[PDB]
Amino acid sequence: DYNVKDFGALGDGVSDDRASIQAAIDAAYAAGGGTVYLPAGEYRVSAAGEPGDGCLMLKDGVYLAGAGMGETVIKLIDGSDQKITGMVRSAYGEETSNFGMRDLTLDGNRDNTSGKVDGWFNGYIPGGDGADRDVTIERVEVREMSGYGFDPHEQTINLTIRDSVAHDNGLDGFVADYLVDSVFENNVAYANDRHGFNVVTSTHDFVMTNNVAYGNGSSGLVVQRGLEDLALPSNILIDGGAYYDNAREGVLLKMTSDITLQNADIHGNGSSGVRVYGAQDVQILDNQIHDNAQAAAVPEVLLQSFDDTAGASGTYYTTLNTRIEGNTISGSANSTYGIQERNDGTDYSSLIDNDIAGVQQPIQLYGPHSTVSG
Ligand SMILES: [Ca+2]
């Protein structure tokens, strides 16, 4: 255990405490691991060097701990004008283990800086054989980043992010880039320019419990393959929470499979409450999907296939085996259907015991093997 102030950190909202804080981290590391504590206050930091160096470099066994969100604030210095891949991060090309941070706030100060800045970043090597392991983030707030809020990256095994908040960031509040056997729980993402939550790049065996996303510039939560022709994310459980008042969809599932969305409240979104776009074996169970299509004539729940024949994969992602059961669906004045399949090859949808109401038309299926009951 080390108090950054014992290493020269002032936390006066002006002085550059980077070196001090980094010194404390290095001491903990050398001691084989420990907690680096930062008393209440605003600690300014500058880029450590190249983008990949971020601001603060965590290492095996080291954890950061503040006096609580909003109480302890690490903020980028005014005038900073370079790309910073993670104000707090782990080393590229190194498999870092047993580390994290809690009870503090990372402020990207994007109003007074330039360059893509991400709050948190960690991982090994994109496309490389290796991963960070055993990472825990608790009660941390990330805000004002010009880039991503929380960006745990390829590859990270057994990561846990809970009771945290990401808001007012340039891109996505939370990203799950190739996370494995990990968990996102009781987190909140709002006012981000793009997505609240963006699960991408082969992430799998991932659980998202009771997370909330609202007021985001795009989708509340999206699970997608990404730009590259890589193994699709799969085996993901979205259990509970709420995704509402987002610019686009509440929940978007694109070029993915084996996803279960259950017990969630989805409302007030610009587009569809739930959109399945080129995915297979998706289960939409016991959700409250209502009052969406606030900005467009779309259905509360949309099912369609994704044509990527001219894209990276040269594949036509046919949507198959979508189970929609036990949901309560009511539209807005614009909601076209309760549930709709596009006549694009999407097939084998199973609609079972769904209460639909307040829409121009309850259901519309086209798949020759798609069924409806109740
Ligand atoms: Ca690392």
XYZ file of C-alpha atoms and ligand atoms in Angstrom:
375
model
C 0.000 0.000 0.000
C 1.230 3.435 -1.038
C -0.252 6.931 -0.775
C 0.681 8.801 -3.960
C 1.324 11.896 -1.865
C 4.237 10.062 -0.247
C 5.682 10.072 -3.750
C 5.160 13.759 -4.417
C 1.591 13.804 -5.729
C -0.071 17.119 -4.898
C -3.569 16.625 -6.270
C -4.034 20.385 -6.446
C -5.896 20.465 -9.749
C -2.861 22.045 -11.407
C 0.373 20.142 -10.809
C 1.244 17.220 -13.067
C 1.167 14.267 -10.667
C 1.909 11.660 -13.352
C 5.475 10.832 -12.334
C 4.530 10.725 -8.654
C 1.572 8.405 -9.189
C 3.595 6.251 -11.570
C 6.368 6.026 -8.962
C 3.868 4.754 -6.393
C 2.586 2.199 -8.920
C 6.120 1.038 -9.617
C 6.805 0.665 -5.889
C 3.691 -1.472 -5.407
C 4.689 -3.534 -8.428
C 8.189 -4.129 -7.033
C 6.630 -5.094 -3.691
C 4.906 -7.864 -5.622
C 1.600 -6.024 -5.727
C -0.479 -3.693 -3.594
C -2.954 -0.813 -3.512
C -2.051 2.699 -4.636
C -4.288 5.160 -2.797
C -5.074 8.717 -3.856
C -6.702 10.929 -1.192
C -9.562 13.223 -2.251
C -8.616 15.884 -4.773
C -8.029 16.517 -8.468
C -4.803 15.013 -9.802
C -3.738 16.391 -13.165
C -1.725 14.140 -15.467
C -0.068 14.447 -18.863
C 0.562 11.867 -21.576
C 3.388 9.542 -20.497
C 4.780 9.503 -24.038
C 3.479 7.699 -27.123
C -0.249 6.874 -27.411
C 0.411 3.346 -26.176
C 1.963 4.712 -22.973
C -1.264 6.354 -21.841
C -0.950 8.412 -18.670
C -0.604 5.834 -15.894
C 0.688 2.305 -16.532
C -0.723 -0.292 -14.146
C 1.184 -3.555 -13.670
C 0.778 -7.012 -12.104
C -0.802 -6.979 -8.659
C -1.333 -3.215 -8.561
C -4.684 -1.544 -7.925
C -5.629 2.138 -7.821
C -7.990 3.331 -5.110
C -9.454 6.788 -4.621
C -11.626 8.372 -1.939
C -14.677 7.645 -4.071
C -16.115 8.679 -7.443
C -16.102 12.448 -7.793
C -13.989 12.681 -4.615
C -10.752 11.539 -6.245
C -10.415 12.816 -9.805
C -7.603 12.117 -12.255
C -7.881 14.656 -15.065
C -5.889 15.288 -18.245
C -3.958 18.579 -18.246
C -5.353 21.480 -20.248
C -3.630 21.896 -23.592
C -2.839 18.226 -24.035
C -2.974 17.593 -27.781
C -1.965 14.024 -28.543
C -3.529 10.579 -28.760
C -3.647 8.869 -25.356
C -4.754 5.245 -25.484
C -5.930 4.896 -21.896
C -5.276 7.466 -19.181
C -4.950 4.331 -17.047
C -3.825 1.156 -18.811
C -1.731 -2.008 -19.024
C 1.275 -2.549 -21.283
C 0.812 -3.545 -24.914
C 2.472 -6.880 -25.669
C 2.579 -7.920 -22.004
C 0.142 -10.312 -20.363
C -0.747 -8.279 -17.280
C -2.603 -9.978 -14.421
C -4.367 -9.202 -11.153
C -4.886 -5.429 -11.363
C -7.550 -2.726 -11.566
C -8.966 0.412 -9.969
C -11.819 1.633 -7.776
C -13.595 4.584 -6.163
C -12.325 7.405 -8.374
C -12.986 9.396 -11.520
C -11.087 9.695 -14.783
C -11.755 12.989 -16.563
C -10.606 13.307 -20.157
C -10.988 17.098 -20.227
C -11.894 16.974 -23.924
C -13.224 20.556 -23.838
C -9.661 21.760 -23.221
C -7.581 19.222 -25.149
C -7.285 17.633 -28.572
C -6.440 14.144 -29.767
C -8.226 10.825 -29.219
C -8.193 10.062 -25.489
C -9.592 6.881 -23.949
C -10.284 6.613 -20.216
C -9.332 2.991 -19.598
C -7.515 0.565 -21.861
C -5.929 -2.859 -21.313
C -5.134 -5.951 -23.333
C -2.296 -7.896 -24.912
C -1.981 -7.778 -28.702
C -4.735 -7.444 -31.329
C -4.670 -10.726 -33.232
C -1.935 -11.902 -30.883
C -1.750 -14.992 -28.671
C -2.086 -13.798 -25.076
C -4.267 -11.870 -22.645
C -4.625 -9.783 -19.511
C -6.253 -11.755 -16.739
C -8.021 -11.137 -13.463
C -8.984 -7.467 -13.774
C -11.397 -5.719 -11.425
C -12.884 -2.252 -11.771
C -15.364 -1.096 -9.152
C -17.248 2.143 -8.632
C -15.270 4.180 -11.159
C -16.574 7.074 -13.246
C -15.123 7.882 -16.671
C -16.188 11.110 -18.349
C -15.239 13.776 -20.881
C -12.997 11.454 -22.910
C -12.695 12.484 -26.557
C -12.607 8.764 -27.333
C -13.895 5.717 -25.434
C -14.816 5.632 -21.753
C -13.915 2.122 -20.576
C -12.036 0.234 -23.295
C -10.970 -3.200 -21.950
C -9.340 -4.806 -25.002
C -8.089 -7.918 -26.825
C -7.556 -10.093 -25.006
C -8.888 -9.881 -21.457
C -9.963 -12.948 -19.488
C -11.984 -12.778 -16.280
C -12.490 -9.026 -16.207
C -15.075 -7.551 -13.881
C -16.488 -4.026 -14.149
C -19.246 -3.144 -11.708
C -21.155 -0.231 -10.204
C -19.329 2.088 -12.578
C -20.414 4.976 -14.778
C -19.313 6.257 -18.180
C -20.790 9.471 -19.559
C -20.084 12.395 -21.885
C -17.399 10.563 -23.848
C -16.601 10.954 -27.541
C -17.380 7.395 -28.591
C -18.739 4.546 -26.471
C -19.290 4.540 -22.723
C -18.217 0.908 -22.291
C -16.449 -1.360 -24.773
C -15.979 -5.127 -24.497
C -13.292 -5.824 -27.071
C -12.543 -9.561 -27.071
C -13.332 -10.125 -23.396
C -13.710 -13.719 -22.232
C -15.326 -15.154 -19.113
C -15.959 -11.640 -17.878
C -18.741 -9.593 -16.349
C -20.290 -6.129 -16.631
C -22.648 -5.525 -13.723
C -24.713 -2.588 -12.451
C -22.989 -0.091 -14.722
C -24.455 3.066 -16.233
C -23.693 4.688 -19.586
C -25.343 7.907 -20.707
C -24.699 11.037 -22.782
C -21.955 9.369 -24.848
C -21.730 10.493 -28.493
C -22.033 6.924 -29.751
C -23.030 3.711 -27.908
C -23.665 3.183 -24.215
C -22.249 -0.341 -24.436
C -20.408 -1.816 -27.433
C -19.538 -5.516 -27.302
C -17.232 -6.402 -30.156
C -14.295 -8.358 -31.589
C -15.056 -11.989 -30.732
C -16.097 -11.374 -27.112
C -17.675 -14.515 -25.633
C -18.885 -16.195 -22.433
C -19.697 -12.718 -21.229
C -22.430 -11.673 -18.822
C -24.014 -8.221 -18.677
C -26.182 -7.949 -15.597
C -28.474 -5.049 -14.772
C -26.575 -2.470 -16.823
C -28.262 0.776 -17.842
C -27.784 2.872 -20.967
C -29.706 6.018 -21.837
C -29.308 9.282 -23.701
C -26.589 7.936 -25.983
C -25.871 9.200 -29.508
C -26.379 5.789 -31.108
C -27.485 2.495 -29.558
C -27.865 1.810 -25.842
C -26.215 -1.575 -26.139
C -24.784 -3.187 -29.237
C -23.196 -6.584 -29.801
C -21.437 -6.711 -33.161
C -18.692 -8.431 -35.130
C -16.938 -5.211 -36.002
C -15.272 -4.016 -39.204
C -13.004 -7.046 -39.571
C -13.915 -10.536 -40.726
C -13.230 -12.099 -37.327
C -14.877 -14.748 -35.181
C -18.245 -13.330 -34.118
C -19.011 -12.472 -30.485
C -21.209 -15.199 -28.981
C -22.582 -16.720 -25.791
C -23.520 -13.453 -24.172
C -26.192 -12.955 -21.548
C -27.863 -9.562 -21.237
C -29.768 -10.018 -18.020
C -31.983 -7.204 -16.784
C -31.232 -3.502 -16.768
C -32.662 -0.816 -19.026
C -31.813 0.658 -22.432
C -33.861 3.758 -23.145
C -33.937 7.218 -24.707
C -31.043 6.468 -27.053
C -30.739 8.016 -30.522
C -31.055 4.664 -32.325
C -31.855 1.160 -31.060
C -32.050 0.213 -27.411
C -30.318 -3.077 -28.172
C -28.672 -3.935 -31.489
C -27.348 -7.424 -32.256
C -25.353 -7.453 -35.503
C -23.335 -10.291 -37.054
C -23.351 -12.290 -33.810
C -24.924 -15.441 -32.340
C -26.044 -17.201 -29.160
C -27.209 -14.084 -27.371
C -29.902 -14.005 -24.698
C -31.638 -10.731 -23.873
C -33.949 -11.073 -20.873
C -35.813 -9.206 -18.152
C -34.891 -5.789 -19.507
C -36.850 -2.574 -19.908
C -36.434 -0.996 -23.335
C -38.208 2.260 -24.177
C -38.063 5.731 -25.690
C -35.412 4.863 -28.296
C -35.200 6.614 -31.641
C -35.346 3.375 -33.632
C -36.438 -0.135 -32.670
C -36.355 -1.310 -29.081
C -34.552 -4.450 -30.211
C -32.942 -5.082 -33.585
C -31.525 -8.428 -34.714
C -29.355 -7.777 -37.777
C -27.696 -10.906 -39.149
C -27.549 -13.097 -36.036
C -28.429 -16.677 -35.152
C -29.792 -18.423 -32.053
C -30.807 -15.197 -30.364
C -33.254 -15.441 -27.453
C -35.410 -12.450 -26.531
C -37.083 -13.469 -23.278
C -39.433 -11.714 -20.856
C -38.571 -8.138 -21.776
C -40.638 -4.973 -21.527
C -40.217 -3.445 -24.992
C -42.269 -0.290 -25.362
C -42.602 3.218 -26.708
C -39.682 3.095 -29.108
C -39.515 4.344 -32.697
C -39.435 7.885 -31.328
C -37.564 9.148 -34.388
C -38.576 6.785 -37.176
C -41.355 4.552 -38.492
C -39.899 1.264 -37.329
C -41.047 -1.792 -35.363
C -40.584 -2.348 -31.643
C -38.647 -5.500 -32.528
C -36.964 -5.866 -35.924
C -35.526 -9.090 -37.354
C -33.446 -9.046 -40.536
C -30.407 -10.593 -42.171
C -27.133 -8.762 -42.823
C -25.731 -8.681 -46.368
C -21.934 -8.573 -46.156
C -21.314 -10.378 -49.448
C -19.592 -7.213 -50.629
C -17.938 -6.611 -47.274
C -14.988 -8.008 -45.334
C -16.470 -11.507 -45.041
C -18.164 -11.849 -48.419
C -20.846 -13.545 -46.343
C -24.606 -13.151 -46.206
C -25.470 -13.376 -42.501
C -28.884 -15.022 -42.465
C -30.846 -14.525 -39.256
C -32.073 -17.910 -37.985
C -33.588 -19.407 -34.828
C -34.659 -16.250 -33.075
C -36.805 -17.137 -30.082
C -39.079 -14.347 -28.888
C -41.093 -15.425 -25.878
C -42.882 -13.886 -22.903
C -42.303 -10.266 -23.914
C -44.708 -7.363 -23.359
C -44.604 -5.015 -26.331
C -46.451 -1.751 -26.947
C -45.438 0.796 -29.533
C -45.394 4.552 -29.834
C -47.374 6.498 -32.413
C -44.670 5.600 -34.946
C -44.196 1.939 -34.073
C -45.014 0.059 -37.284
C -45.119 -3.519 -35.939
C -44.721 -5.261 -32.612
C -42.415 -7.821 -34.225
C -41.280 -7.793 -37.870
C -39.148 -10.062 -40.033
C -37.809 -8.597 -43.248
C -38.490 -10.754 -46.303
C -34.730 -11.172 -46.793
C -34.257 -14.835 -45.972
C -34.544 -14.377 -42.214
C -36.142 -17.633 -41.077
C -36.992 -19.958 -38.190
C -38.254 -17.245 -35.855
C -40.349 -18.569 -32.962
C -42.762 -16.058 -31.449
C -44.294 -17.456 -28.288
C -46.644 -15.884 -25.764
C -45.906 -12.230 -26.443
C -48.373 -9.541 -25.401
C -48.349 -6.991 -28.211
C -50.426 -3.806 -28.315
C -50.493 -0.196 -29.457
C -48.847 -0.822 -32.831
C -50.041 -0.423 -36.412
C -49.803 -4.228 -36.701
C -48.860 -6.809 -34.009
C -46.758 -9.211 -36.088
C -45.384 -9.840 -39.563
C -43.414 -12.976 -40.403
C -42.094 -14.210 -43.753
C -39.751 -17.082 -42.960
C -41.309 -20.319 -44.329
C -40.316 -22.076 -41.114
C -41.129 -19.158 -38.816
C -43.953 -19.727 -36.350
C -46.237 -17.707 -34.099
C -48.427 -18.760 -31.179
C -50.445 -17.226 -28.368
Ca -1.234 -5.757 -20.830
